[PDB]
Design an enzyme around this catalytic site. Structure first.
Site, PDB file in Angstrom:
ATOM      1  N   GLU A 194       0.852  -1.185   0.000  1.00 18.16           N
ATOM      2  CA  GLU A 194       0.000   0.000   0.000  1.00 18.16           C
ATOM      3  C   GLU A 194       0.887   1.233   0.000  1.00 18.16           C
ATOM      4  O   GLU A 194       2.102   1.112   0.077  1.00 18.16           O
ATOM      5  CB  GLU A 194      -0.949  -0.002   1.198  1.00 18.16           C
ATOM      6  CG  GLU A 194      -0.294   0.232   2.537  1.00 18.16           C
ATOM      7  CD  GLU A 194      -1.261   0.031   3.713  1.00 18.16           C
ATOM      8  OE1 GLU A 194      -2.394  -0.441   3.484  1.00 18.16           O
ATOM      9  OE2 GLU A 194      -0.881   0.341   4.860  1.00 18.16           O
TER      10      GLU A 194
ATOM     11  N   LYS B  98       2.682   4.811  22.363  1.00 15.07           N
ATOM     12  CA  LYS B  98       2.023   6.092  22.653  1.00 15.07           C
ATOM     13  C   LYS B  98       2.515   6.685  23.984  1.00 15.07           C
ATOM     14  O   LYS B  98       2.778   5.956  24.938  1.00 15.07           O
ATOM     15  CB  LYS B  98       0.502   5.915  22.659  1.00 15.07           C
ATOM     16  CG  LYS B  98      -0.133   5.674  21.290  1.00 15.07           C
ATOM     17  CD  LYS B  98      -1.554   5.146  21.433  1.00 15.07           C
ATOM     18  CE  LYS B  98      -2.151   4.765  20.090  1.00 15.07           C
ATOM     19  NZ  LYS B  98      -3.384   3.940  20.214  1.00 15.07           N
TER      20      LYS B  98
ATOM     21  N   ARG C 186     -11.417  -3.758  21.156  1.00 13.23           N
ATOM     22  CA  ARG C 186     -11.301  -3.783  22.611  1.00 13.23           C
ATOM     23  C   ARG C 186     -11.332  -2.348  23.125  1.00 13.23           C
ATOM     24  O   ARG C 186     -11.222  -1.398  22.336  1.00 13.23           O
ATOM     25  CB  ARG C 186      -9.951  -4.384  22.993  1.00 13.23           C
ATOM     26  CG  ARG C 186      -8.772  -3.678  22.328  1.00 13.23           C
ATOM     27  CD  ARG C 186      -7.446  -4.152  22.895  1.00 13.23           C
ATOM     28  NE  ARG C 186      -6.333  -3.700  22.088  1.00 13.23           N
ATOM     29  CZ  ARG C 186      -5.794  -2.498  22.183  1.00 13.23           C
ATOM     30  NH1 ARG C 186      -6.272  -1.637  23.049  1.00 13.23           N
ATOM     31  NH2 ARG C 186      -4.770  -2.155  21.414  1.00 13.23           N
TER      32      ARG C 186
HETATM   33  N1  LIG Z   1       0.825   2.738   4.942  1.00 13.23           N
HETATM   34  C1  LIG Z   1       1.610   3.255   6.009  1.00 13.23           C
HETATM   35  N2  LIG Z   1       2.297   4.362   5.826  1.00 13.23           N
HETATM   36  C2  LIG Z   1       3.060   4.896   6.810  1.00 13.23           C
HETATM   37  N3  LIG Z   1       3.136   4.307   8.022  1.00 13.23           N
HETATM   38  C3  LIG Z   1       2.455   3.172   8.274  1.00 13.23           C
HETATM   39  C4  LIG Z   1       1.655   2.604   7.254  1.00 13.23           C
HETATM   40  N4  LIG Z   1       1.104   1.499   7.763  1.00 13.23           N
HETATM   41  C5  LIG Z   1       1.504   1.351   9.018  1.00 13.23           C
HETATM   42  N5  LIG Z   1       2.334   2.348   9.367  1.00 13.23           N
HETATM   43  C6  LIG Z   1       2.942   2.536  10.637  1.00 13.23           C
HETATM   44  O1  LIG Z   1       3.480   1.262  11.194  1.00 13.23           O
HETATM   45  C7  LIG Z   1       2.604   0.950  12.335  1.00 13.23           C
HETATM   46  C8  LIG Z   1       2.133  -0.452  12.226  1.00 13.23           C
HETATM   47  O2  LIG Z   1       2.365  -1.132  13.421  1.00 13.23           O
HETATM   48  P1  LIG Z   1       1.940  -2.643  13.584  1.00 13.23           P
HETATM   49  O3  LIG Z   1       0.895  -3.011  12.541  1.00 13.23           O
HETATM   50  O4  LIG Z   1       3.160  -3.519  13.402  1.00 13.23           O
HETATM   51  O5  LIG Z   1       1.344  -2.874  15.016  1.00 13.23           O
HETATM   52  P2  LIG Z   1       1.134  -1.702  16.027  1.00 13.23           P
HETATM   53  O6  LIG Z   1       0.798  -2.267  17.378  1.00 13.23           O
HETATM   54  O7  LIG Z   1       2.429  -0.855  16.139  1.00 13.23           O
HETATM   55  C9  LIG Z   1      -0.247  -0.611  15.477  1.00 13.23           C
HETATM   56  P3  LIG Z   1      -1.670  -0.928  16.561  1.00 13.23           P
HETATM   57  O8  LIG Z   1      -1.701   0.164  17.693  1.00 13.23           O
HETATM   58  O9  LIG Z   1      -2.954  -0.843  15.777  1.00 13.23           O
HETATM   59  O10 LIG Z   1      -1.526  -2.355  17.190  1.00 13.23           O
HETATM   60  C10 LIG Z   1       1.496   1.881  12.299  1.00 13.23           C
HETATM   61  O11 LIG Z   1       1.117   2.288  13.631  1.00 13.23           O
HETATM   62  C11 LIG Z   1       1.923   3.009  11.534  1.00 13.23           C
HETATM   63  O12 LIG Z   1       2.428   4.058  12.390  1.00 13.23           O
END
Ligand SMILES: Nc1ncnc2c1ncn2[C@@H]1O[C@H](COP(=O)(O)OP(=O)(O)CP(=O)(O)O)[C@@H](O)[C@H]1O
Ligand SMILES: Nc1ncnc2c1ncn2[C@@H]1O[C@H](COP(=O)(O)OP(=O)(O)CP(=O)(O)O)[C@@H](O)[C@H]1O
Lengths: 439, 439
Positions: A195, A232, A286
């Site tokens: 994407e 966060k 959740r």
């Molecule tokens: N198309 C995109 N373009 C830029 N950054 C992206 C992206 N898709 C994902 N990201 C970044 O990578 C992260 C994906 O993290 P991941 O899917 O491994 O689990 P996670 O726990 O960090 C997100 P969540 O809080 O939903 O669980 C996203 O939070 C986002 O910041």
């Protein structure tokens, strides 16, 4: 209805759930590891059951032990909180099959949104805007893949249904080959898609509730862009820059998605927000850590609604009843070194928590409490509310100045640095800002 | 405008004022006695000045020392809080004559409402309902006095502009003679009047603000009927049974009274409320202890408004902007024996304050703090908010259950007894209820 709930979690969220239960007259069962006998909610619970030794794998992730706790206490329902088993579909499935109410969505819906290709497919079908992408798994034919990547436009990111960014066609073939081969050995799932890689986005997420009466509502949004290594640090609501018109558009699309997919309970739609456009990345099925900022600006008790929904009741209000009022901020206070971010377990010799108008403190920590090594490092959530964003910020600064946690290190100094940052004060900084500022 | 404020008070209200100042960017000067060097707000203040030894007479009531503190620090204004000098017209007068802004009404207005006969006269003139009475001081002619008392209707109460109840004409002549002779030697003021003695009333009080722009607003009311020996224990807002129609009527009359008398700042009109009728007894010309319950149901920051008004600004909202939402309760947590009500000074070895949604904690106490003998016994105000009165009550019960104050005795057990009382849960108990229940 719901007479007795197993709180299948720990720390602050376990206490938050206990408080909601007690307000509703719901009996509580605190399941805990051996290291958590001293947790505030355990001490306040109606019944307690030790479900294993300290390590999470042996206790809070012990599915048979938790279900056995519900069985022996004659509980009606299990609240998974966040983290741990809350988005484990195998758990949800076993809880329902065992005759208890899972306070969350159905297992099928968890699994649906737990897979990124299928989650995205459902969102597309429901009219929720998604990141431009392959829409489906990627072929092996690099020709078709260069065609798709060119359509989307570099940079793209390859992602397993972990991620790899590609900024030119030069690299595309390998990049797809590796992410596919390293995502198949990690979790027997070689499925990957591509994407658009958004380089400058904010993290903006929409809170929903959906009940078993066919209702679904949106409760504005939160900006969670202030992050370090994807963790966060500070969250706020509403998101700066978001008008009520935009809110109603995206919000209503999320609510419809809930009904289309058969959603039940609290959930969150996460978006990357860039150049005024929303792009779906994940649904958290959740309650979340940062739910309190939404409570402060809407007047909704999100955990109480979870319990009411699980008991079979309708959401206690209608969409037209919700209006954003004021602004709220949340600082996640962690027991960790404010510079190395290494955990800082040990005895809190003295706690002084802040108060006054517009100050909310959600924490299980107390003076004399020992922060254990075995779990995450969050010890408190300091939440402020004000009529304006500026007031919420000033109130957070003053409340932090009053907060004393002696005996362990905390990240309070990081929060103070963030709150006085001129760019943060202006608002709207992107998800990369905190790492850039920290160097 | 207001750049620097002397906080001419102590304890929790001094901290409340400090928090408001800091939010507005106003520099603070904490004046304190030798026994209060360890007060939380003193430790947080920008500047500190010792104004005398422990006893109130030598410190917090030391008019020259407080004014001298404003002079040396080049302060602009003095906030008297509640109690101490806050309704001392001599103080207000000296503060203004010395070139500082008194954060309160003018001295003339303090003296006006500080005298019961003149206060009542002004309220009558302004259209505020008053207790039927002699309307003016009583003669010596017992004939005229028996005529007036008969008009009013027994029981009556004789009151100096301290009180004596008369239930028959048999006793009237002496009763008037004594209250007059014992009120003249106590405070060179033999002036006394009579009015109807209301045997079954509630204490219902209306919050107002009035500015120097000619605006005056009412902020609903509070029920403060839960009292022991005339000392408030629990307060709530709004008052059960009071409709919005009744609220607008009495509220608007209080607002008009403010303008008629030249009122400035925060104030409260206290009424005895019986058989659906309001009867004025006093105006408190200052902020009050129980202001937070009004803040919770209206969204107004009453201390911030005091500061803005004193700086010459208009009230920050219009009457039409205020709408009562939900319900709030406040428990005054005192360091005292819960049965004998004798003070309980000493070291707080451990404090654990409650939190979560709808819980507000206004307190200067911290673990390791020693509660001194020299002042009042209030150590904290626990305030809850809910969508309904029932929720506010349950939330107060749970928050009290979480509260730990080790090393000294408190009245938490009394609050717990009150909150679970079936009559209190129904609402609307009279000012005599708590003493009756306690036996
Ligand atoms: N198309 C995109 N373009 C830029 N950054 C992206 C992206 N898709 C994902 N990201 C970044 O990578 C992260 C994906 O993290 P991941 O899917 O491994 O689990 P996670 O726990 O960090 C997100 P969540 O809080 O939903 O669980 C996203 O939070 C986002 O910041
Ligand atoms: N006409 C009346 N009928 C019945 N009770 C009356 C009354 N007038 C006064 N009272 C009671 O006696 C009390 C008067 O107290 P007082 O005037 O001595 O100072 P106070 O501090 O107790 C009231 P405040 O809070 O305004 O200072 C009132 O609070 C009220 O409860």
């Amino acid at each position: 209805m719901l007479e007795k709930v197993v709180i299948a979690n720990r720390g602050e969220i376990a206490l938050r759930i206990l408080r909601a239960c007690k307000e509703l007259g719901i009996k509580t069962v605190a399941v805990h590891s051996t290291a958590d006998r001293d947790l505030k909610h355990v001490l306040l619970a109606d019944e307690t059951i030790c479900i294993g030794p300290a390590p999470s794998a042996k206790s809070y992730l012990n599915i048979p032990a938790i279900i056995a706790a519900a069985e022996v206490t004659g509980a009606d329902a299990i609240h998974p909180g966040y983290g741990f088993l809350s988005e484990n579909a195998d758990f949800a499935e076993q809880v329902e099959r065992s005759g208890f109410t899972f306070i969350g969505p159905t297992a099928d819906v968890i699994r649906l949104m737990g897979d990124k290709v299928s989650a995205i497919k459902a969102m597309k079908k429901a009219g929720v805007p998604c990141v431009p992408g392959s829409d489906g798994p990627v072929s092996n034919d690099i020709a078709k893949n260069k065609e798709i990547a060119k359509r989307i436009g570099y940079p793209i990111i390859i992602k397993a249904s972990g991620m790899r960014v590609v900024r030119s066609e030069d690299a595309l073939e390998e990049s797809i080959a590796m992410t596919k081969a390293e995502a198949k050995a990690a979790f027997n799932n070689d499925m990957v898609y591509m994407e658009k890689y958004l380089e400058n986005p904010r993290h903006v997420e929409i809170q929903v509730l959906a009940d078993t009466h066919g209702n679904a509502v949106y409760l504005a949004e939160r900006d969670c862009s202030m992050q370090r290594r994807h963790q966060k640090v500070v969250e706020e609501a509403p998101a700066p820059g978001i008008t009520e018109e935009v809110r109603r558009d995206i919000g209503s699309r999320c609510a419809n998605a809930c009904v289309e997919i058969g959603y039940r309970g609290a959930g969150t739609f996460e978006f990357l927000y860039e150049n005024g456009e929303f792009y779906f990345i994940e649904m958290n099925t959740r309650i979340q850590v940062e739910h309190p900022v939404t409570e402060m600006i809407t007047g909704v008790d999100l955990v109480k609604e979870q319990l009411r929904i699980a008991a079979g009741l309708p959401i206690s209000f209608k969409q037209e009843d919700i209006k954003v009022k004021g602004h709220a901020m949340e600082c996640r206070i962690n027991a960790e070194d404010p510079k190395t971010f290494l955990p800082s377990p040990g005895k809190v010799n003295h706690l002084h928590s802040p108060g006054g108008l517009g100050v909310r403190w959600d924490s299980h920590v107390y003076g004399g409490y020992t922060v254990p090594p075995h779990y995450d490092s969050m010890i408190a959530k300091l939440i402020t509310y004000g009529d304006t964003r500026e007031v919420a910020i000033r109130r957070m600064q003053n409340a932090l100045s009053e907060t004393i946690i002696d005996g362990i290190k905390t990240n309070i100094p990081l929060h103070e640095l963030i709150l006085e940052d001129e760019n943060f004060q202006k608002g709207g900084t992107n998800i990369h800002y905190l790492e850039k500022k920290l160097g």
